[PDB]
Amino acid sequence: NKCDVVVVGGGISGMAAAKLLHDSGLNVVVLEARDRVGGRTYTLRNQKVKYVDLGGSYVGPTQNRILRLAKELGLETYKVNEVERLIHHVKGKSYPFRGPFPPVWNPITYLDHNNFWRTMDDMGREIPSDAPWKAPLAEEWDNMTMKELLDKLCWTESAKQLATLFVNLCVTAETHEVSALWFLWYVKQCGGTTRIISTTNGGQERKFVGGSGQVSERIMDLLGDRVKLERPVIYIDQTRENVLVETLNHEMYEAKYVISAIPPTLGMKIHFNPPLPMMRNQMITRVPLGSVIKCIVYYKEPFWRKKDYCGTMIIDGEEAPVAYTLDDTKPEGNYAAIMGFILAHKARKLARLTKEERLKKLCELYAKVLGSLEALEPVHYEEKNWCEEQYSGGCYTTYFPPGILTQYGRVLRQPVDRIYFAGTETATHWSGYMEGAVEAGERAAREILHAMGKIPEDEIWQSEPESVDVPAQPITTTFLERHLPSVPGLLRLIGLTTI
Amino acid sequence: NKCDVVVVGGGISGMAAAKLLHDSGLNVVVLEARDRVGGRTYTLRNQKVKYVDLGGSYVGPTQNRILRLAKELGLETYKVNEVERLIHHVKGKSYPFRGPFPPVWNPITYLDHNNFWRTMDDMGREIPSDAPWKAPLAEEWDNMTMKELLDKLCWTESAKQLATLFVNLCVTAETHEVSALWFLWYVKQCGGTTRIISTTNGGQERKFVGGSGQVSERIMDLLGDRVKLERPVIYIDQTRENVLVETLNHEMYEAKYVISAIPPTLGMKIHFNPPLPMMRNQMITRVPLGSVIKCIVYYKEPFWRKKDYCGTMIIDGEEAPVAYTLDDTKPEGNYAAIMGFILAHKARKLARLTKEERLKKLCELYAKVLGSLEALEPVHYEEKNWCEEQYSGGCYTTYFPPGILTQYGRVLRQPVDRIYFAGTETATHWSGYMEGAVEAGERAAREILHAMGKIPEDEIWQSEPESVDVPAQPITTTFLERHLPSVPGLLRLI
Ligand SMILES: *Cc1cc2c(cc1C)nc1c(=O)[nH]c(=O)nc-1n2C[C@H](O)[C@H](O)[C@H](O)COP(=O)(O)OP(=O)(O)OC[C@H]1O[C@@H](n2cnc3c(N)ncnc32)[C@H](O)[C@@H]1O
Ligand SMILES: *Cc1cc2c(cc1C)nc1c(=O)[nH]c(=O)nc-1n2C[C@H](O)[C@H](O)[C@H](O)COP(=O)(O)OP(=O)(O)OC[C@H]1O[C@@H](n2cnc3c(N)ncnc32)[C@H](O)[C@@H]1O
Ligand SMILES: O=Cc1cc(=O)oc2cc(OCc3cccc(Cl)c3)ccc12
Ligand SMILES: O=Cc1cc(=O)oc2cc(OCc3cccc(Cl)c3)ccc12
């Protein structure tokens, strides 16, 4: 029954909030809908795989809150394999390379590719991380999809195809589904295009030894029986002196404050008394999650490394079930594996198949991309379709369709009386990631500490010291990258010399 | 506890289904979240207005099922006032007109406007009513917003501004929010642009004497104690012999079958066991409802009639709170009033104001458009902001953002085990309206009758005889409307 704060949701955000609150001396309870903690992180263990992350997995430089939280829990990271060459597979052929971006040789195409990435970042710098709706052209940008933006910007099909794969991979949604403003904010708040797509020096640099699901489990250990499993919240009543939170299995909890640490749309699964204010009531029906199947095929050895491929494949084409892969081999070099994502519409289309049918398509694709018959001999397969999860709604995160962020975005983390809002969707730095979950959980716990009169207002938002274990190389550009014209810029230059 | 069918929701659709099954001899229960029936219909009564519809109100020709149902309940309709001239207010001046569409005088603008309305209807002819995802260009049209379509189509700002108002009024959403495929389907399954926008011989022809809220009320009267108010469903368990339906107030119902008669996205408020299949699980997070404030300003007399204006106003531009009005005067000529809609982003923007502030902005606008100081002296005001309703989500109806219809649309009315889907969103003719609520409720009730072996499969979908009281006249076009070129068509001749 009685405590100081009820946290709804026991993913990384809810658990980080509850930890911070418990450490400050408050009585907290965490109500978790599932028979497990971790939410969109989930570490499967069995004898065949040892452990494997089926949800959120990668961490990297500039993600200093999840690194510090995980380090304090006694966790360690290891580097994702990028020793050998990456592959870009396009129009049925593979092209090995080094560096974060596939190289482009054709000079006109090079200008178009260079201008594409440069412009994403140019536009992003006009967008405040904490208030994207305050960008000067916020309305214009929000009223366009990413497909429309790409249509205006990309003068070559080569750039437009790569850019489409970029969007599908970043937000598990089609370019026609998402707001240009939202997507430009999303990339910028992770530190830009280079940071977001990079393995070395970027978001996919590292994984946690033993799995990311340990973060949530270890905090559950510290909190003990304050974590209540299989307590889906159905009802929040704020009409009396203390808040009442009711669960599906018939229990009632009384609290001074509530943290909602669930994806924004899952807020719909709760009946509110009094009803939510209008802006929030409608916002929660306008913010879906993307569609992805995360698939892991195991092999006897990491045979790709022998042909000088690191296991990274960027695979363009409608026939390809998987558009992106990484080496998922253990740091000890055993349980050789390839992780791949089935993205957006393909997750919907391929969900119709059996597990065995999907394994077969993946192996056939990998054999072709890697030019290797060994890829047709899996020893094991694990997969997870996040579209089927009642208590997630999708993965990795919430996307904004056109027109939504400028109209409703300002209420995302606005308190509703004594309900405060956590979850990765409400973060301002790596929103959508385990990193943003930690930022949002800890910020919402501090909003409650400030309301209780325990901390001053200036301590609600707190900087994080850089990790000493995972240093961040700065993002740099060359002089030519900076000053080379776009395609229409060069055309304008030609019309000027000719006139 | 125990019955044959539990219907979740007591709006028109859920009540229609329950009535059909009751009349068949089955034992029905209706679980309704609110302290009232009607849902997105709501008739307020007080001495100042007598009665007023603050949600769904209008009915018209080709809406035969709502007309039959209401007649059986003892209801009568009357005609919305369209005797005098309509007004199109553009660039700060009023231009009175007759006929459904505002006239265009510039020859280039004329061609552009003509082409727009014509093209909406041509594109709709390729969209099947019962399967819009089967349109030959479904993906291409689904992957574009209506804003993109209008930018391509409309060569003048005049046409683009009227087209925009059209979208905003029809679906209470912005052009950039909505799929082109879904919008074009929506228009097509109402019978086309003329039918949808017309008062005479269209959707706004008539209203119910005493209010549309009487439809649900009178069915509730007929169902006895089978309707349970303040029973929001929170849980549906299908793992056993009988379906188990649990309510927020701790009650438990057991039935052979369930009809879900609530907006698709409101299905999010129910915890399901076993979980819903993947496609429906994601579909119900992808389908918002629009945003509207319905506002009624009352006057001593319908003074506009003295100036040969009927009270219909089509008001262009960003600055105007209301883009569209109709005369809301009672048949007897008393309780004079103007009904107006504050639409889409204006509902969001103006909601922060007080009721009295919105009243003043409305009266000043109507004074300017009607050219009458009489509009400045209202006797009463009523309004309803539908965006604030927990158990509606919005009004009038669900819209589909780009990409959604083709990817998810086929699961909208696919049964989940022993759960069948009603609600106006599931209709194939006047979906979004009271008419479509009836169609979908009665169809869902018959799917279950068929599941019980009571009727054959060919009796699940049933045609409706035309109303004798509200007969439909055909929509016609002229030779020039059909054959005049578009702007780029005239350019190609030059
Ligand atoms: C799914 C996924 C995610 C993911 C990704 C790949 C996939 C396939 N890769 C990532 C990566 O490599 N690196 C990274 O940093 N993030 C990655 N992502 C996203 C990441 O997993 C998420 O950003 C993060 O896990 C989100 O955390 P958050 O704490 O904000 O949210 P949650 O995990 O969804 O947890 C919410 C909890 O709430 C419970 N719930 C839901 N409804 C209720 C009710 N009504 N009552 C009580 N509890 C409720 C959920 O069960 C959950 O535990
Ligand atoms: C709001 C509105 C609607 C409207 C319109 C103008 C406005 C401002 N103009 C219309 C018009 O002139 N002519 C017309 O035919 N339609 C017009 N519309 C739309 C029309 O009202 C709707 O299409 C129709 O009313 C929809 O009926 P339906 O029965 O399909 O849906 P509903 O009214 O929303 O009823 C659903 C009921 O379900 C209850 N509910 C919701 N959740 C639960 C749970 N969990 N448990 C139990 N009950 C639940 C609702 O409270 C509601 O009663
Ligand atoms: O955003 C999340 C994310 C999770 C992930 O596992 O891999 C990514 C890989 C990305 O980029 C890989 C890449 C490299 C070169 C070109 C292109 Cl288009 C993409 C971008 C985001 C991600
Ligand atoms: O769709 C619902 C709807 C409810 C209504 O009350 O009035 C309408 C009026 C409409 O058209 C009026 C109109 C006339 C002439 C031009 C334009 Cl753009 C609009 C269209 C839909 C509606």
From Swiss-Prot, chain A:
Membrane topology: Single-pass type IV membrane protein
UniProt xrefs under Pfam families: Amino_oxidase
Record's GO cellular component terms: mitochondrial envelope; mitochondrial outer membrane; mitochondrion
Catalytic activity, EC: 1.4.3.21, 1.4.3.4
Molecular function per GO: electron transfer activity; flavin adenine dinucleotide binding; monoamine oxidase activity; primary methylamine oxidase activity
Site features described as Important for catalytic activity, chain residue numbers: 154, 363, 380
Effect after changing residue 387 to A: Complete loss of activity
Enzyme class: oxidoreductase
Result, substituting residue 363 to S: Complete loss of activity
Residue positions, PTM N6-acetyllysine: 50
Effect of mutating residue 392 to A: No loss of activity
Subcellular location: Mitochondrion outer membrane
Residues modified as S-8alpha-FAD cysteine: 395
Regulation: Inhibited by deprenyl.
Stated family: Belongs to the flavin monoamine oxidase family.
Protein name per UniProt: Amine oxidase [flavin-containing] B
